[PDB]
Structures are given as structure tokens and as C-alpha cells.
Amino acid sequence: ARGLVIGEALIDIVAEYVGGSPLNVAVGLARLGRDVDLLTHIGRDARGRRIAEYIESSGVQLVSGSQTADRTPTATATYAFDLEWQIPDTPPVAPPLLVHTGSIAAAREPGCLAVAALLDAYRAAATVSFDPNVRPSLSADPDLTRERIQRLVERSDIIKASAEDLHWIDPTQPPEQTARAWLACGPAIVALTLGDQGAVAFCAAGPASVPAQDTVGAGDAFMAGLLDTLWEQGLLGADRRTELRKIGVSALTSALEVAALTSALTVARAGAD
Amino acid sequence: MARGLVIGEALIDIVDPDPAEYVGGSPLNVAVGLARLGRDVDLLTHIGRDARGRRIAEYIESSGVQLVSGSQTADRTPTATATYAFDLEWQIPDTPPVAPPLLVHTGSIAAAREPGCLAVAALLDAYRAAATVSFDPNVRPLSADPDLTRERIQRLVERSDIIKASAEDLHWIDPTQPPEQTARAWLACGPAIVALTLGDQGAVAFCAAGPASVPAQPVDTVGAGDAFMAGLLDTLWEQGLLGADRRTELRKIGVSALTSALEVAALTSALTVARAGAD
Amino acid sequence: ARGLVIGEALIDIVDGEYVGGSPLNVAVGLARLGRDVDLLTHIGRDARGRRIAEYIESSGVQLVSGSQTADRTPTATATYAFDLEWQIPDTPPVAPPLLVHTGSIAAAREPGCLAVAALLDAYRAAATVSFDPNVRPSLSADPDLTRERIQRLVERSDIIKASAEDLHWIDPTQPPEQTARAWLACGPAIVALTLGDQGAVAFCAAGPASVPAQPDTVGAGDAFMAGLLDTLWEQGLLGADRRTELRKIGVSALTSALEVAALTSALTVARA
Amino acid sequence: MARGLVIGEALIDIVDGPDPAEYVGGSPLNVAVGLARLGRDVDLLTHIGRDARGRRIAEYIESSGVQLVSGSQTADRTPTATARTYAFDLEWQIPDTPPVAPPLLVHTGSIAAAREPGCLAVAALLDAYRAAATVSFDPNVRPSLSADPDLTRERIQRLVERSDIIKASAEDLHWIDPTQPPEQTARAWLACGPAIVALTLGDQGAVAFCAAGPASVPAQPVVDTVGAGDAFMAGLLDTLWEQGLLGADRRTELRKIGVSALTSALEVAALTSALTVARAGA
Amino acid sequence: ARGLVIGEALIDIVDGDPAEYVGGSPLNVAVGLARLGRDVDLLTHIGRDARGRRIAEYIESSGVQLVSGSQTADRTPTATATYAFDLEWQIPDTPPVAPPLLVHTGSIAAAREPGCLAVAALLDAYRAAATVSFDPNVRPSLSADPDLTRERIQRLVERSDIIKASAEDLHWIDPTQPPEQTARAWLACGPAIVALTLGDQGAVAFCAAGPASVPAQPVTVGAGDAFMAGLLDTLWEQGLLGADRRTELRKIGVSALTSALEVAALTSALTVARAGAD
Amino acid sequence: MARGLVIGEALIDIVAEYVGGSPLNVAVGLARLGRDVDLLTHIGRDARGRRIAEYIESSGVQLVSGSQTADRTPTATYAFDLEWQIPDTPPVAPPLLVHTGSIAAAREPGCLAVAALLDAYRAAATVSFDPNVRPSLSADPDLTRERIQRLVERSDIIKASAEDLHWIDPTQPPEQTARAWLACGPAIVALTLGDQGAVAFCAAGPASVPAQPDTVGAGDAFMAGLLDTLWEQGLLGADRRTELRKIGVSALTSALEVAALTSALTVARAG
């Protein structure tokens, strides 16, 4: 039972910190006690070394070819990105239970093509999960990225997005309307965070909600808590795809609760220091 | 005294801890709910002449509900076993012995299960010259023929004055729209009022005059939902809006009147739950 | 550097007399928040008008010349009975007003409403255009003309504020949030929507904002509108040369403006 | 002595336009008339009125040698279908239990299989007659949709599960599932209990599926697609009757029909349809 | 009422003192539509050299109006015989014509940077006024990331009202599935009509109302483009082009679609037969 | 040098007794088309065994030593009377081409040898397979479907009829099953469609030949023609396997045509 996460690790330059939404999920899952493979695109520079030791000291196995970048991608704080996203297209691990992607990795050439291939490869074995995590401050035109998000929605079992992500995707529609249009395209679960208004999620059986409980990584800790509780309910792996789609409102409500409490806990432990 | 008529299923819930048997059916709970708030109510149902049947009849009589003649012709009293399996027939006489009622309430399984759902549809049409028509779809999970179920619910929407549904009901009716979109599309088809319960977020209702809202309160969600429906009909009854002769005044209900009808329904539901949880 | 408000001022007469009019209340609200404001409405040379005129003056609001040439001061008698004409000069004696606000009966009642639409297009070169539908259907008129006039004002507006009740009446088949998002996509920078004791939401290109509740019915909304316009003024987002900055308002900045608007309304109620 | 029973609508087709006319119609009525014309004894349970159109339909039925089942003439007015834009003035209701001896074959389809309240009684009659009779079904969705634009697929699938022989058109099965080639739908129908699912492909001929395998017949070189399909159905049922495969008695032999016997049934169905058309030619 | 075709115009050099011919899939559709009596504008990328002047004259003789900004290429594109390309595709993304009834693109113009980004923009600019038609016509020999190619085809499929493809195009798009299934799947992304040519087996097409087919014609280069011109010309005549008719185009009946395939198959066959003469 | 190997049943068809068995027919077909072929069969020493042995020799095929070990030569008449057994290791030099199918791929015991034998010969030979479904040989159909699927995974060329694939999976159209079979390793899957002609699937795209204006001798002779023409094109042997996988639609079309005409020509030349 191993999980594969594909996406960007980077340095958040405000003082410097280790980040990347796909990395936060990898380390969130690991810290909750899952076996996680994290194939990223970092450098062999000081920043790349700090990332690799942050990944190492967290229990996430860094997949080979993840350290081939010219320079380690950075985000300087309304962010400014100096980043390339490119990955080896060869399936690097034995078929996982779960393959998760999103953020810059899902939408940025040339890695976004490899990512979508690898998703197409591992789908017969793995639950596919994906989070929009729209970082619009990136240097890339809006149409290709909206279209690539819509194509990853069509290939996904589990989706998490923010009201902010879905407002960017389509400002003309309430985020619930967009999430419901996403559920109708194939996913078992579309989870939607609503900030100070809580979270909602949608499956065939009905809507689930958790009431209201603004800091970096809260969304990725939510996703990690969601995939971790769905793992624990025995609904991950392609073997269990039919049972994921059939998840009850009660089970969905529980998962949401856990994901929301896991996100709050991560924020409250960070604000304690 | 003006009388209410409820048309729908009465059954035994068999709960498979300490296996137990409870009297249920949403339309039965609404009849029983209206009777306990002091209304005169007939129930037209379909139960057998065995133990379960005689218990439903005793529980009905005990609460002040009159069982309509022709209700006791089933081979076997319906049951639902909680994997929620059902052993149910729904059939009713095309022409029941009932004098024109002030209000007709139907829905649940009675509204969508063959062959009785055809006669339920025809009776709502015949009783609307005298009666306010109310409808609670209350989709019981399992329930087959999704599309046929949706077509039959839509035809009852077009013949109803008052509708109450849950967020879950309307998600099942149309998963691509927020429940409020479906409730407002229902209002546009002829109802005076469409009320929508939202669990721990309270309830909303729509009328021509505008939207109404009530916040949530502090145990079965459908048991609570049936007491909400009885409270809503009892309060509109008290406001003097029931009967074909009051249909134009019901359609013209104010946001304020509607808001009070919703608060009363909410308080009535919560009180039914709080009194039952204390035993 | 002044605000203009175009629309009705009336006396509210209860069942069995108060100075009212939704635009008047926004003008007074802006004045009482310390903004220079002109109001160009229609009030009689009679008893009612003088009380309106002195209420206006007492607030710090300059009445616009050509407004007091009214056959009878318009009246609202509580349901509501309207004894009212709405007429304005094709061209008012006032300079581009940094902001021009209209709505309510003025935007839909003839013959006055035809000038209003023309004036909003002409004032757009120097002023931010704000609009509050504040629907009052008691004063009857072809319902589909009312809706056509409102939609044309929406197209010429930078800031819209509306109630769930207003957008229910505009289109009872959609939730109010859907109507508000459709309005936003027709030109405005900001559509604000009040939802009673469910608080308020607002929409802008950057995203949605909200404030929760509890922090007069018509009077309240008018003071919300004044407080919204006052905060956007203070943020430096009003005037034609600030239009692109208004369209790009941040969710944080729009959340601040909603909070000030909600508190301004609540504080106006509480003080009276 | 063995008799066939057809349960379905009989109606008047009204053509509104240049040089207007009224024709006897109804897919199930055509099948009954087609079987009677091939020499079979056939009863037709339908719903017509005792008006001018009803008598005309009744006369047409008796001239073809079809026996009208008692209770078929209680309609308030004979159903009609008008092509101006398709408009239907039709009611479909039948006695829950008709006065008919156990037939060898019971055929239904079209509007009668999907229009309430009559369709409920039709589904119950198929379940009760299957102990003695072979059940045949022709979805014939085109007119059903023209009538009920909101028609649901669940009505058709329930009849699939009760049927031994199904004939449908590519157009029928496209409507049932537009995401799949009609052959995929026909094979899914076959796996639900039928002995035979026949699929007409217009000017590409016809295919059929049974447990033993697929059969096909090429297109005829050569109008009236709704009138040719009914003759095809009549010829398929008549030839299976001839091969001794009808009656609950031979249900296991009908399921075990070989590709060769199925191919021959299809050729006879296709030629019967072609010949029926060619004869209308003059 | 004007069509606008956007695509590559190039010279087909034969393998062998060989000969050169004016070619390009979109060029052929524009010329084909012009020859059937329709007013067509063609936005392309050619040079001011000898091959560029040959294409321009050919366009001019065919009745097609060349669109301003089509002759800014460094050198006229070339395809030589499997084919070898010396091609550049770049076009202004600024709408150069009054909104047309119909905007058609396909082949290399769809899948090749930078001009493919412009093609997507112009289809987005004109869709409110124009029918969008598209012919995948895959030319894999033109060295490209095949996943980027597939993605850029899908993004045109999502924009299109009318698609025509070969069995061989859909095979390359998705080897695992019968072309009939890729076509049915394409109809599900928005199109009104997905027509599929099956060579010696005839052609089929898919709309909301059902499938249509036409048998094998009793009879090589450009037969596909002539089929497309013939399909668009009959849909034009049936009154189904223009965004104002987009709802009626989706509601097209099997009978009307069948007619359009028949005219398309005969138009293709007549273009071959006339070429087998000369 | 280059020799073909066919592994499977040779039997007696009794209506009047005839030499038959589908693998025997492919071996005979190949020999009659001028190819050198070894047949590894399971025949008896009796009046029918020596009838089969005589037919095999008079056509130019060579028996594979240890074939005539059967107590009784197997029989058709269908009500099957036969056993299927082979030596784990045939006395055979590495062939260019190994072909099996029919009862030999599914009937125990040797049906267990056949699958390992194909994996061993794959290093030098192209592997071909014709399921030629025949259920009247009663046996557990799910292990039959399992054995067929394992052979599919180790084959380079597969030929099947619509009837064969219908029995494999009746819920799918035969082209769907054939395209699914091609994804498990094969370079070519050929599918005969009775009087609708034949199609074949490879990586480069589909081929078709229309119907020809008849025993299951015809199917076998189609398979012999297909193998014979892929031999001539230079695509048989392990060292040509990548060129076989990359066969063009044009070349596959030509192979389909030669195979359809070979089949057509075999039936007509008999009647």
C-alpha cells in the first residue's frame, strides 16, 4: 500500500521555506503514517539540498530523476515564480494504490504532458486524486490552463478545490455549481473548501458539509487528511473504484470532518510557534 | 370541522443489537403528526389483515387518525428491513369513500410506486377543486427507475400547492444544480410554496412574494422531516390559507407569514425530537 | 470632488409623516459620513418639500437647482400607496460628479427614468456609476419594462447593491447569487448582495467576499449603500480615472468595504 | 389451431399538407395483419372507438383475417397521429385480463409498450402469458418519442427482460445508448434473457444474435421504413413459427437456435419486408 | 455570406526532375468551397517567392480571396515524398475579417506552434457569429511531441460544430478503439456532426438524432478535402451554418445528415474523377 | 533452412470417414503452398492412424517423432472421441514459425505443454494461434477461456472467426475482442466475418477485404494463406519480430487479400 505524488517542490522566498502544494500533500500523508513516493523536479544546489533533506526527514521516498533541474524552482512574495516543470515519463514505481497531482505540475509544459500520460498509465491500478490549487501569478496563458484542469477533472476519482480555485475556473457560476459540474464528468468525490464558511463535498449519494472552524499549506493538509481518511475507509486502489463512487453521505461527512480537523490542527500547531 | 386526507404508505420498519419493529411510513407520520396537533385527519393506505396490519391500525386509531375504508386489502403489510431492503405493495382504490377534504397530502413511495402512484396522481387532480394539495417527495434511497421516479415527482409538482423537500431529495432529483435552483424551478410550475430543509443549516421556503429563511436548531432525519411537514401544514391551516377557496390567498402568502410558518414547522420538528429523546 | 445622487425624495405616511426616498437616504448617509454630495430629485413648493429641503440642508446635502418644480411633493402611504410623479431636466446644473448614484423608483418610473439612463451614460466619463435596484412594485407599471430598464442600468453601472428580495422579484427562477454573478459579467466592477440575517456577499473579478449578519428595512439598506460608497471613496477607487483600479479590487479590499457597509447600516439602526 | 396474440395500438395516420389523407396505422396492428396475411390465426387486443375511424379500422382488421379481441372498442375516440410537426390524439388503456385462450405467441411494441396506463397491463400480460407463449417485442422508438418527447429508457429495458424475441432498428438502439454502436446494445439485450435479438440496419441489411452466434443478411438493392419494419417482424415470427420454435414448449429449442436456422429466419424476414414494399409499388 | 478558412497552403513536391503542385488541406477546402459557388476568404502563411506567387495565382484563379497578412512567411512551406516538411505556420491572432458564417481549420494549422495558438484565438473570437468546422487530417511525419499534438486536436474538437475525420486519423488519435467510438466520443464534447470516412467502406456520421451512412462509391490526393467542402457546401444550402442556426444544426435529422454525406461522397468522387482525367 | 512447426490435433471426421483436425489442415495448407513443415500431433497405430500418417506424407509435411503414440487415433463423427498429450520437449530444431490452436490449446493433458513450448520457441520463432472454438468437446469453459487468453499473450499472429470470439465473449462485438487481444502482445489479429469478408488489426491501423462471391477447411486454408504470405513478405522468425509488429496497413491488406483468395481458391478447386 504505497501512494505516488507527482508535482512541484520549491522554496517560498517571502527568509526562505520549503513548499510546493504537491510536496505538502506528500509530507502530509507521510506525517499521518502512509508510504509515499514523491517524484519532483529540484536542483542539486543549496535550495535543492534543503528540499531533499526536508523530504528525507519526513519519511517520503524521493523517486529517481527528481534532482535533474538546472536550478531549484522558487516562489518570491501576489507571488513571482522562477520555475521549470519537467519529469521523466517512464513509470518509476510499482503501481501505487493512489496517484495524486495538481498545482503547477498538472498545467505547465513540458511536465504537464508526462503527468497526464503517467495518470493515464497508473489509473487501472490507482485512485487518481487532484487539487486545482490555481497559482495565477505563474507565467502561462489562462485558456490552456483552464482546459488542462478540465481534462484532469475528467480523469480523476477524488478532487479537492477552494472556492477561489473554482471562481478562477468560471466566475459566472457559484463554486458549488462548478463542483457539481465536475462530479458529473466522472469523479467519485468533489470536495470544496469555503474558507470561514467550512467545506462541502459531493458524491452520487448526496451533498456533505462541515461548518466553519488564511495561512500557507492549510489546503494541502486538508487534502492529505482527506486522502488519509479515504485510505483508512478502504476506498482507494482501482480495485475499490466502484465502492469509492458509492461512498455514503455519512462516510463522506466523516472524511470531510477529518480533513477539516487535520487542516485546522496543522494551522494551530504552526500558529503556536 | 374541516378534515385533512393523507394518501400514502404505512409500514413496519424492521431494524436488524436488539432487533425491533416500529410503525412508520412518512405519510403515516404526517397523518399522525397532524392529529397530535389537534387536526381531524383521514389516512388512505395499503396494509394487510395480519399482526403488523392490526398494529398500524391500532397506532393510527390511538393517535386520533381515521383509517379510510379500502386501506386493509394488501396480501401482506409492507415492511422495510435495515442494505435497506423492502417488502412492499402500493395499491389504492381509484375512488375512495372520502367527502371533499380541505387538504390532500401525498408523496414518499406512494407517489412513485406502481400501480398506486397512478391513482395518487388522478386523486390529487380530483381533490384540488376542494383541497389544498401538499407533497413531500422524500426519496427513500433504495428506490428504482430513477428517471421514471423523476418524471412522476415532476407531475406531482405541477398538481401541488405546497411542497416540502430536503437538500438530499433535490440532489437526487438533479445532482447538477444546487437544491435552491430545483426548488425555485418547482415554484415556477404552479405551487404557492416550496419549502426546502437544509439539515443543520435550518430551512428555506420560496413563494411569489419572496424567499424566507430560518436558522438551524441545536433523531431520525425523516421522522424529524415528517414532523416538520405536519407543523408546516398545521400552521398554514391556522393562518387560514388551506382549502381551494383560499388557494389565491395561499399563493399570495407574505414573506413574514411564510417565515412564521417555517419557524413553527422548525420548532414543531425540534420539539417532536426533544420529547422523544427524553422517553 | 463631489458625489451626485439622482432620484426620489418623499414623505413616508404610516397607516392611520416621515422624510423618505431611497436615493435621498443614500445622499444624507454620504453627507453624514462627511462627503460633499448633491441630490437632484423632484419635490413640491409646498409643506412636505420644505421639510425635505431643511432635512437635506441639516444633513449637509446640497439640493440641485431644478428639483423643486414639482406639481405635488410625492407621497408613500403604508403595503404601500404611491402618490408620485418622477420628472427631471434633460440636463442638470452640476459638474461631472466623481460618483453618480441612482436607483429605486427613479430608475423605472416615467418620464424621469428616461433622462436617468441618458445621464448615467454621459456621467461615466468622469464619475463612478452606482445603482441600487431597491424594487418597489406597489407603484405599478409594465413589469417587463421595469425589468428592461433595470437591466440597461446594470450595463452602465460600476457598483450594484441589491437585496435577495430585489433579485427574487427581478428573476424568481434563479437564486439571487446567480442573478448577481450574471450582472457582474455585464460590466460592473462590484455587485453587492444583502441576504438579511445571513449577512452580505459581493462579487468582483478577483473573487467573492462575504460578511456574516448582526453586524428600518429600507433605511438599513440605504445606509449599507452609503457606507459601501464611502469606504470605496476612502480606498481611492471612485472616479473615471480609478475605474480600472475598482474593477481590479482585491477580495480583501472588497471584504473590508462589505464590513464597513454592514457596520455602518447596523450602527445607523442602533443609533435610532 | 394454435393462435398468436398481438397487443398494441391501432390508429389513423393523418397526413396534413399537399393532397392530405387518412391511413390505417399502428405498428402492432401492422404485425397482426402481416401475420394473418402469411396464413396465421391472430387475435389483436387494441384500443379503438365506436366512431367512424373505429369502424374503418375494425373493417380493415376483419378483411385481413385478424380477430379483434373483445374489449378493444371502448375508446372515447379512435386514436390518431397527425403529420403536419407530429401531433398525437391517443389514449392507451386495456382490460387487465382479456378474454383470450393461452396463445402460442404474444407480440407487443411501440406506444402500447410505453404509454400509461395501458403499458402497465401490457407488462403484466407478458409475465402471465409467458408460461404458455413465446414473447416477442419491437421497441419501435421513433413514434413513441414523437408522442412522449420525455420518454424514459427504463420502460423499454423492463420489456427486454420479459422477451424471447426482440427486433429493433439501429435508430431504436442509438436512442437507448448513443455512446455505443447498436450491436453493443443488441448483445447487452441478448445477455438479459432473450433467445434472439434482431437488429435492422436500413440499407445495410440486418443482423441477429443468439447464444450460438451472430447471423447477418445484406441490404436489398431498393421508403416506408415504419411500414417495412412491421412486415420484417411479421416475417421473422411466421418463419420461427414454421421452424417449430414458438410456444413455451419450445422455448429451450428457441434459445438453442443455430446460426444457420437464425440466418434463414433473417433472410425470410428481409425478403418478406422487401416483397411487402415491392407489392405496394403497384 | 462569407466562409473563412484558416490553414496551411504549401507545395507538394513529388519524389523522383520531379514536379511541384499547389497543396495544403485547408487550401483545398477553400478552393473546393469556392468552386461550388461560395464566397471564401483564406488566411494562410506563404512567402513572396516563386512558390508563393504560384499559390497566390492558384487561389486567385479558384475564386478564393486571400486574407491580408497571409504572405509574411520567410519562405513558402514545402512537403516532399511518408512526407518531409520544410514548414513554418505563424499567423496574426487579430480578427482580419467581418464575422463569417463559417470558420474552418484543420491539419497542420491546428497542431503546429506558433500559428495554432492564433487559430484557437480566432475560432474563440468568431464562434458567436460563425459555425466552426474542423478536419484533424493528421500528418504525423511533421516532427512534433505527439501528446502536444493530441491535446491541440482535443481543444479544437471542444470548439467545433462540424468535424470530419478519416478512420486513419482516429486510429492515430487513439489506436485502442474502433474509429466509430472515437467519433461518438467526439460528438459528446459539443459538436453537432462528427463525420467519419472509412475509405472503400463508404462514410458514416453522428449527430444527436442518430447515425447516418453512405455506401462505397464505385471509382487519391485531396479526396478528403473535397469531401469536407462538399459536406460544408450542402450544410450551407440546408440553412444550418451561422451561430444563429447552431441550435438547428444540432437538431439536424438523420435524413438531412444522410443527404449531406451523399453530396459529400459524390463531391469527393467527382474531384478524383476530374483529376484522373487531367 | 527455415522450417515451420504446427502443434495440435489430427483426427478422423466421420459423416464416410475424412482426415481432419484444424492444425493438421494449416500444416497441410502450408506444405501445399511449398513451405517445409513439421507436425507434432497425437495419432494411433491403426487403419485410421496410418490413413492420417499417409495423408501427412503425401502432402509433404513431416511427422514430429513421438506423434504416433496414441492408443487409438482420435475421432469426430460433433461427438469427440480423442486424447491430447505431447512430450514436454519435441525432437525439433528451432523453427521459424510455431502454430497451434483448436483442441490442442485447450484439452488436457498436453494443453499444459503447449503453453510452455510457445514461450520456449519464441526466441527463434514467430508464434501463431487460431482458437477455432469447438465446445462440443465438453470441458470447464472458464479454464478453456483462461488457456485461450494465456496463448493470446504469447502469440505474434492471431486469427479467429466471429463465431470463435462470440463464444469467448458474447457481450462484445468481435472487433472489440480482437482489438483487446492485440493489446496483450500480438503484432496482428485477423478476424474472418463470414460473408462480410475479413479484417485485421496491427499497430499501424486496420485492414479489410470484402466478402468473396464451404467447410471450416476454409478457415484453416485462410490461416495457411496468411502465414504463407507473411513468410514471403520476410516477416517470420524472432529476428523479424519488430518488422512484423510494424507491418504497414498496405502490407497487412495484401496479406488479408492473399489469405481470403487462398481460402476462396481452396474451396472452389475442391467443387
| Nearest Cα to Cα of residue E234 among E213, E203, E264 | E264
Q: CA of A176: which chain B residue's CA is closest?
A: B178
| β partners of residue C39 | C5, C63
Q: Are the C-beta atoms of C15 and C78 separated by less than 8 Å?
A: yes
Any B CB within 8 A of C172 CB? yes
What DSSP designation does D7 have?
E
Any D CB within 8 A of E80 CB? no
Distance, CA of A203 to CA of A246 (rounded, Å): 8
Q: Tell whether the torsion through CA atoms of B258, B263, B265 and B266 is positive or negative.
A: positive
Distance, CA of D195 to CA of F263 (rounded, Å): 32
CA distances from B239 to B39, B256, D64 (A): 14, 12, 66
Q: Are the C-beta atoms of C199 and C3 separated by less than 8 Å?
A: no
CA distances from E199 to B252, E202, E261, F179 (A): 67, 6, 13, 20
Chain position carrying cell 462530479: A183
DSSP string, chain C: --EEE-S--EEEE----EEE-HHHHHHHHHHHTT--EEE----BSSHHHHHHHHHHHHHTPEEPTTSS-BSS--EEE---EEE--B---SS-S----SEEEEEGGGGTSTBHHHHHHHHHHHHTTTSEEEEE----TTS---HHHHHHHHHHHHHT-SEEEEEHHHHHHH-TTS-HHHHHHHHHTTS-SEEEEE-GGG-EEEEETTEEEEE-S----HHHHHHHHHHHHHHHHHTT--SGGGHHHHHT--HHHHHHHHHHHHHHHHHHHHH-
For D78, phi then psi, to 5°, come to: -60, 135
Q: What experiment produced this structure?
A: X-ray
Distance, CA of B21 to CA of D240 (rounded, Å): 54
Distance, CA of B207 to CA of C100 (rounded, Å): 35
Distance, CA of F64 to CA of F93 (rounded, Å): 11
Interior/surface letters C253-262, b for 16+ CB within 10 angstroms, e for the rest = bbbbbbbbbb
Joined together, the cell numbers standing for residue E190 give 459539443
Q: Tell whether the torsion through CA atoms of A128, A133, A134 and A138 is positive or negative.
A: negative
CA distances from C74 to A172, C16, C38, C56 (A): 40, 18, 19, 16
CA distances from F104 to B116, F109, F230 (A): 60, 9, 23
Distance, CA of C172 to CA of C168 (rounded, Å): 4
| Nearest Cα to Cα of residue D6 among D77, D142, D90, D98 | D98
Distance, CA of F271 to CA of F265 (rounded, Å): 10
Residue partners of A14: CB distance under 8 A and separation at least 6? A76, A77
Q: C-alpha E12: how far from its chain's center? A: 17
Q: Are the C-beta atoms of E1 and E101 separated by less than 8 Å?
A: yes
Beta strands across the sheet bearing B65-67: B65-67, B41-44, B4-7, B103-107, B132-136, B162-166, B193-197, B203-207, B210-214
Distance, CA of D263 to CA of D207 (rounded, Å): 9
Any E CB within 8 A of D179 CB? yes
Distance, CA of A70 to CA of A36 (rounded, Å): 25
Q: Are the C-beta atoms of C233 and C261 separated by less than 8 Å?
A: no
| Nearest Cα to Cα of residue B51 among B9, B6, B14 | B14
Interior/surface letters D133-145, b for 16+ CB within 10 angstroms, e for the rest = bbbbbbbbbbbbe
Q: How far is C206 from chain A (nearest CA, A)?
A: 8
Residues of A in contact with E120 (CB under 8 A): 143
For A34, phi then psi, to 5°, come to: -105, 155
Q: Between β-strands E10-13 and E2-6, what pairing exists: parallel, antiparallel or unpaired?
A: unpaired
Beta strands across the sheet bearing C18-20: C18-20, C10-13, C75-77, C81-83
Beta strands across the sheet bearing F126-130: F62-63, F37-40, F4-7, F97-101, F126-130, F157-161, F188-192, F198-202, F205-209
Any D CB within 8 A of B125 CB? no
Distance, CA of E219 to CA of E225 (rounded, Å): 17
Residue partners of C48: CB distance under 8 A and separation at least 6? C11, C17, C73, C75
Cα dihedral A21, A27, A28, A34 in deg (nearest 10): 130
Q: Are the C-beta atoms of E45 and E91 separated by less than 8 Å?
A: yes
Contact E148 A117 (CB under 8 A): no
Contact A109 E148 (CB under 8 A): yes
Contact D175 E213 (CB under 8 A): no
Distance, CA of B59 to CA of B79 (rounded, Å): 16
Q: How many CA atoms lie within 13 A of A150 on its CB side?
A: 16
What DSSP designation does B59 have?
H
Any B CB within 8 A of D153 CB? yes
Distance, CA of A67 to CA of A39 (rounded, Å): 9
Q: Which of A181, A184, A207 sits opposite B171 (nearest CB)?
A: A207
Q: How far is B207 from chain D (nearest CA, A)?
A: 28
Q: Which of E178, E211, E215 sits opposite D170 (nearest CB)?
A: E211
Any E CB within 8 A of F176 CB? yes
Cβ-Cβ pairs closer than 8 A, D with E, add up to 23
Joined together, the cell numbers standing for residue A60 give 517520503
Residues of B in contact with A209 (CB under 8 A): 199-201
Q: Are the C-beta atoms of E212 and E256 separated by less than 8 Å?
A: no
Residue partners of B128: CB distance under 8 A and separation at least 6? B104, B159, B244
Which H/E stretch holds residue D138?
strand D134-138
H helices present in chain B, as ranges = 26-36, 51-63, 116-127, 146-159, 167-173, 179-187, 221-238, 247-251, 255-277
Distance, CA of A231 to CA of A249 (rounded, Å): 17
Distance, CA of A28 to CA of A220 (rounded, Å): 7
Distance, CA of F102 to CA of F6 (rounded, Å): 12
Residue partners of C264: CB distance under 8 A and separation at least 6? C29, C33, C223, C224, C226, C227, C230
The number of distinct structural domains making up chain A is 1
| β partners of residue E103 | E4, E132
Residues of C in contact with A167 (CB under 8 A): 207-208
Distance, CA of F82 to CA of F14 (rounded, Å): 13
Q: Tell whether the torsion through CA atoms of F224, F225, F227 and F231 is positive or negative.
A: positive
| β partners of residue C53 | none
Beta strands across the sheet bearing D66-68: D66-68, D42-45, D4-7, D105-109, D134-138, D165-169, D196-200, D206-210, D213-217
| Nearest Cα to Cα of residue D113 among D154, D159, D148, D68 | D159
Residues of D in contact with F174 (CB under 8 A): 214
In Å, what resolution does this model reach?
A: 2.2
Any A CB within 8 A of B200 CB? yes
In degrees, rounded to 5, the angle at the alpha carbon of residue A221 between the alpha carbons of residues A220 and A223 is 60
Any C CB within 8 A of A164 CB? yes
Q: CA of C165: which chain B residue's CA is closest?
A: B210
Contact B177 A180 (CB under 8 A): yes
Contact A173 C181 (CB under 8 A): yes
Q: CA of A167: which chain C residue's CA is closest?
A: C207
Any C CB within 8 A of A171 CB? yes
Q: How far is E173 from chain A (nearest CA, A)?
A: 14
Q: CA of E120: which chain A residue's CA is closest?
A: A143
Beta strands across the sheet bearing E2-6: E65-66, E39-43, E2-6, E102-106, E131-135, E162-166, E193-197, E203-207, E210-214
Q: Tell whether the torsion through CA atoms of C244, C250, C253 and C256 is positive or negative.
A: positive
Query: For an interface test with B, which of A178, A209, A250 has the most B Cβ atoms less than 10 Å from its Cβ?
Result: A209
Contact A174 C185 (CB under 8 A): no
The boundaries of the domain holding residue C16 are 1-272
| Nearest Cα to Cα of residue C205 among C177, C180, C185, C175 | C185
Q: Do chains E and B touch (3 or more CB pairs under 8 A)?
A: no
Q: Do chains C and D touch (3 or more CB pairs under 8 A)?
A: no
Joined together, the cell numbers standing for residue D136 give 416477442
Residues of B in contact with A184 (CB under 8 A): 175-176
Query: For an interface test with B, which of D94, D115, D116 has the most B Cβ atoms less than 10 Å from its Cβ?
Result: D116
Which H/E stretch holds residue D15?
strand D11-15
Any E CB within 8 A of A143 CB? yes
Contact D213 F172 (CB under 8 A): no
Query: For an interface test with F, which of D187, D189, D256, D260 has the most F Cβ atoms less than 10 Å from its Cβ?
Result: D187
- Determine the 3-state secondary structure of D177 from DSSP: coil
Distance, CA of E194 to CA of E104 (rounded, Å): 14
Q: Are the C-beta atoms of C232 and C35 separated by less than 8 Å?
A: no
- Determine the 3-state secondary structure of E205 from DSSP: strand
Cα dihedral A48, A51, A52, A54 in deg (nearest 10): 160
| Length, in residues, of chain B | 279
Any B CB within 8 A of C259 CB? no
Q: How far is F205 from chain E (nearest CA, A)?
A: 6
| Nearest Cα to Cα of residue F193 among F171, F216, F167, F174 | F174
Residue partners of B16: CB distance under 8 A and separation at least 6? B81, B82
Task: Work out the burial of residue A245: count CB atoms within 10 Å of its CB; fewer than 13 is exposed, 13-18 middle, 19 or more buried.
Answer: middle
